[PDB]
Amino acid sequence: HMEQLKCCSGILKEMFAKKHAAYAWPFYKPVDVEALGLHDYCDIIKHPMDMSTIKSKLEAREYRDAQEFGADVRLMFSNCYKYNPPDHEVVAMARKLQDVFEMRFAKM
Numbered sequence: 001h002m003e004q005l006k007c008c009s010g011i012l013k014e015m016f017a018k019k020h021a022a023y024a025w026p027f028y029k030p031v032d033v034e035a036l037g038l039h040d041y042c043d044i045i046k047h048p049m050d051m052s053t054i055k056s057k058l059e060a061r062e063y064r065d066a067q068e069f070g071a072d073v074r075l076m077f078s079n080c081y082k083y084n085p086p087d088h089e090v091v092a093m094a095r096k097l098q099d100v101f102e103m104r105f106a107k108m
């Protein structure tokens with residue numbers, strides 16, 4: 001699984017790339033519930049996730065395989081779709097970033 005984890009690190013680096021920043025930036029770090037004033041975020045989202053946490057987990061070798069890495073990336077997008085109304089701008093941004101992830105993750 002060392003080779004598939006190098007691919008996971010490559011995919012995450014691509015998600016942080018300048019060419020995707022216009023839609024990736026809300027996912028770079030944890031949702032700051034207090035600063036944003038997000039009503040009941042912690043009641044609705046039991047397992048928050050973001051790209052910096054995923055990066056820290058890859059560096060600490062916490063994912064034993066590609067499936068575990070992919071589960072955290074999809075959790076990050078799922079939390080966004082779950083919390084927000086479907087018409088929210090952040091949801092449209094999550095979909096664009098998920099295009100990047102799914103298309104590369106499938107080429108594992």
Ligand SMILES: Cn1cc(-c2cc(NS(C)(=O)=O)ccc2Oc2ccccc2)c2cc[nH]c2c1=O
Pocket residue numbers: 025026027028029030031032033036038079080083084089090093
């Ligand atoms: C994942 N996410 C993130 C934000 C969000 C986060 C931060 N900065 S941060 C990472 O918290 O430090 C800044 C703005 C944010 O809002 C917008 C981002 C773009 C367009 C409209 C809203 C958010 C807000 C409500 N829902 C969400 C959500 O689900």
